[PDB]
């Protein structure tokens, strides 16, 4: 029987590439999404056309609130309901925008940035562990977490907290055979929202090829960590950044 | 005119040691507290006996909620109200208890552990900056053992990791405003009030430098250094005060 | 045409396992050794018996000296002489013994521990780059480098230097398309000879399975890093440590 | 009576500021130097004029060689000869120049850069410990050690090794009551001869004040670490960098 994975924020960009690559490796997948319903459904259709009954969708807002724990339990339950098992969890969903220290209320900014990047991953990890082979969790971290973008305090706080969870959960879940690791992009998939000077600016900074990573290149590191070639790896965060984090100001 | 400082969770233990040391150094202090009203007012009294109108208490819950930003703005406002200025913010208040992955609800555990150790610091830092020859700084109480977490303390550890991020992010963003943001990271310092002595000494024997926990004063000494003119170029630095504990393998 | 790899300290233990796995993967290999002449020649014999003309040995002392640069240049030259190309360098060879602060002279301890663990990797890197495809270098680091063993200051200084080399070379060699990464064991392959009681003491410290890594598990991470699935990864150090580095005192 | 301190490389710039500030705090000092004999002699004169026979000079090359251990033992011996005690060691002396991976020979660059930045500090640390209250060692590290300057591998390796020494020696010397810490400048006291327009290119990068640290600001962290206000501080590296290491590419 085929193992099953949950991928959060899987309708597009990097999460989509991760879902596709896991599916290509033999996994049945739960495609979690928030607003991108059309793309999520379209992906499930593509994957199921490829192998019957190997993809479902699960919608949820991963903003922090009093109902988040239940939402996270529901996402995990989705995988068990469809597939009878949940082997892999990939915490990819993430809000990202500036929150200057000096439009949304600040409390809403806290809820979204800290929720998606950290609390939800924790609650998902909890539900995943409680519901239990090669079991593992992969968290999408930031290679430049110690050289933060100006004015992105809350995002960066969420991403540091995710490092904490990766390490703490690796330690605590190791007794149950559940590995917990991170994959930490530098820049990958520059937005269409972004100008040509701005994109070029980022690309010129990347030592290895002066270009951003493709989504597939991020997904390759996820595949490695969930594989049997990573059986002794837990609590490790693998940068997939082309050397970007090594470049001083 | 004397500068003024806000210390969170300053009614007892390390926070009090910090408020006391700042006060001795010439600061006027806002003693924030949550449940320890008697301890806070008593400290405020001691300090005002030393110098009149140099201490005030300020009560606030720093659990995450949708009014936390208001609460944090009020704390800073209380320093301006009392003293006409606010030079130093120390983020010391902290909830600490296990939250196993496998009867406070989890919502409450998330709110208290992430609110006190990270979100309140952020919102206080926001309010401190917004409300502004001077020496403005923020000191965050971090964990020296943040990368070797205690078993079953994931939310507390997430909170402290987030506080590293805030220290770095805020150092970067507030530097152009003349506001320095640093950390002090104890290893083991004042042991929990309810801990016994088979266990207190088990923590003590782990510490390379002296086989003993740090005194509150020793933690405060590092805080006083970072707020001082002797640290005028230091920002985004987290100073470990751990007797080498973080260097010891399993 | 088959790519080629130099593995230092490859006659036994972890370097041998890395050489065996690269070879099983399709590489021709230079098996470098210092003293284990017999284990080394036996390994080339066996690999060549499996695929003709795919392994050679190369003897060099990697202690620091004024001749170390020529010795490192010759190692890389030996790979080109045998195979016509040099695609991969694995800096595995390492002296390891205590050097307390309070039979070998200190001169000799410095030369052996700092030479093998840091200066030879640097010179081999230089010769690798100067002599020049998915080109990459993998350095064998320590997962515990920031929680050092008591009385192992020079060994630890070496392994820290190795971290700096991994990062500096990743940055500098990126424009040439050469990736530089690290694999960081916690405990792996305990000396057959170390006492059993001491062995079980190390084993009981590892969160994931309460056992040391196999040599093959370490090699798996090397294989990942030199592969086409790691083409945007440079300057990354992957712990393969079962969470050991995460455990407080 | 008054404590005593060795400062390596103390004839000018940051080492000189450290020596002066220690002396002003009440220490007697050994002013170590290599080439700068006029400045070292002149400094000791100035300090002895303040307080009689509270300063001596000591010349030594700290390049790695077979005689480096005796050289370092003689530096510590010189403190004992002059003042009968040695309470503080400041490892400040450092060679700094590029060593590209692609007329000094490379073995000489290894010897100078690894010798001054790491091996001499180790040797001085050994001698200091052997010859033994508030005893401590302060090592001059880099805030930018994980974002290395392009083509400065050997220097960066040296500074990484020095982090490792700081930590290893803190652990090992703690039972002797000797604390071991570091001070990590970002950019400080730029060379007088560097054009001001090149100086401004570094300055512009520093978040706190768009300027470099004074030598005195660096010395202030050293004075803190050696003081009774840092009596529980060991194995800590304090960045004094105006936020520079936080700024991304
Ligand atoms: N791209 C990079 O260069 C880069 C760099 C560093 C780190 N990362 C990390 O790598 C991961 C993938 O990056 P990305 O650029 O692909 O991410 P992204 O496109 O910014 O976001 C991925 C998905 O997150 C989901 N999401 C956002 N807010 C949400 C909410 N409130 N509740 C539930 N889901 C929500 C969205 O779902 P819907 O679209 O369905 O609304 C979105 O598709 C992220 O964790 C990111 O932080 C990426
Ligand atoms: N002690 C150590 O060994 C150690 C180790 C590592 C890190 N640290 C860090 O150093 C700091 C001081 O340590 P400590 O042991 O002195 O701290 P503590 O005694 O555990 O807590 C300090 C104060 O935090 C306040 N607090 C707790 N929950 C709160 C809430 N919901 N809202 C507002 N305030 C709240 C309490 O105020 P009231 O009493 O008024 O309710 C308490 O007095 C903490 O940040 C801690 O994490 C300490
Ligand atoms: N085993 C672990 O738990 C562990 C933990 C952390 C890091 N690592 C790292 O992983 C790598 C492999 O570990 P290992 O246990 O397999 O190493 P090892 O058995 O201690 O050393 C491997 C080889 O190093 C070579 N070597 C030693 N001194 C040399 C010299 N002066 N010149 C040239 N070569 C020399 C030896 O070659 P000859 O036999 O031919 O003389 C030896 O076979 C090392 O870099 C090590 O530091 C291992
Ligand atoms: N300046 C910065 O921005 C910066 C940044 C990062 C780290 N640091 C560190 O802070 C410390 C002080 O920096 P700096 O800029 O003041 O250093 P520096 O001027 O480049 O060098 C300091 C002294 O090192 C001595 N030295 C050089 N080679 C030597 C050798 N082979 N043997 C013995 N002594 C030798 C020299 O002595 P003589 O003059 O007597 O020959 C020199 O005066 C250094 O360890 C440095 O790496 C500084
Ligand atoms: C949709 N995008 C742009 C992202 N989405 C999410 N959820 N997280 C992101 N993190 C980054 C980022 C963060 C720090 C340093 C570099 C890239 C990014 C980012 C920022 C710039 C260019 C490309 C990616 C990012
Ligand atoms: C009241 N106490 C005990 C604390 N309070 C707060 N708010 N934070 C704390 N953090 C720790 C701690 C964390 C990691 C490693 C060691 C101690 C502790 C801690 C835990 C055990 C022994 C001493 C201190 C701690
Ligand atoms: C042959 N051995 C014993 C080694 N050889 C080399 N070249 N390097 C080694 N590094 C380690 C090590 C170092 C720090 C923490 C754990 C293992 C070790 C090590 C030390 C103890 C048990 C297992 C491995 C080691
Ligand atoms: C005399 N100088 C220039 C130095 N001397 C020594 N012994 N070490 C030095 N380290 C640096 C440095 C290294 C990395 C990043 C920034 C500055 C420097 C440095 C490099 C550039 C500008 C100012 C200082 C430096």
Automatic annotation (TrEMBL), chain B:
Family matches, as Pfam families: adh_short_C2
Binding annotation for NADP(+): 12-14, 34-36, 61-63, 92, 94, 156, 160, 187, 189-190
Annotated active site: 143 (proton donor/acceptor), 156 (proton donor/acceptor), 156 (proton acceptor)
Positions contributing to substrate binding: 137
Alphabetized UniProt keyword annotations: Nucleotide-binding, Oxidoreductase
Family: Belongs to the short-chain dehydrogenases/reductases (SDR) family.
Protein known as: Pteridine reductase
């Amino acid at each position: 029987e085929a193992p099953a994975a949950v991928v959060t924020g899987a309708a597009k960009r990097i999460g989509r590439a991760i879902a596709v690559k896991l599916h290509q490796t033999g996994y049945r997948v739960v495609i979690h999404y928030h607003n991108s319903a059309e793309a999520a459904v379209s992906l499930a259709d593509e994957l199921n056309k490829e192998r019957s009954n190997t993809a479902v969708v699960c919608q949820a807002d991963l903003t922090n609130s009093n109902v988040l724990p239940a939402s996270c339990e529901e996402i995990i339950n989705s995988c068990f309901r469809a597939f009878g098992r949940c082997d892999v969890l990939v915490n990819n969903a993430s809000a990202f925008y500036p929150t200057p220290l000096v439009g949304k209320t600040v409390e809403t900014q806290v809820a979204e940035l800290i929720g998606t990047n950290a609390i939800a991953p924790f609650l998902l990890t909890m539900s995943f562990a409680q519901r239990q082979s090669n079991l593992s969790i992969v968290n999408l971290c930031d290679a430049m977490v110690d050289q933060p973008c100006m004015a992105f305090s809350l995002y960066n706080m969420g991403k540091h907290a995710l490092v904490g969870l990766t390490q703490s959960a690796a330690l605590e879940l190791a007794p149950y055979g559940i590995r917990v690791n991170g994959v930490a992009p530098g820049v990958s998939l520059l937005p269409v929202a972004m100008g040509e000077e701005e994109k070029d600016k980022w690309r010129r900074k990347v030592p290895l090829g002066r270009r951003e990573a493709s989504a597939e290149q991020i997904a390759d590191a996820v595949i490695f960590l969930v594989s049997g070639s990573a059986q002794y790896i837990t609590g490790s965060i693998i940068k997939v950044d082309g050397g970007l984090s090594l470049v001083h100001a």
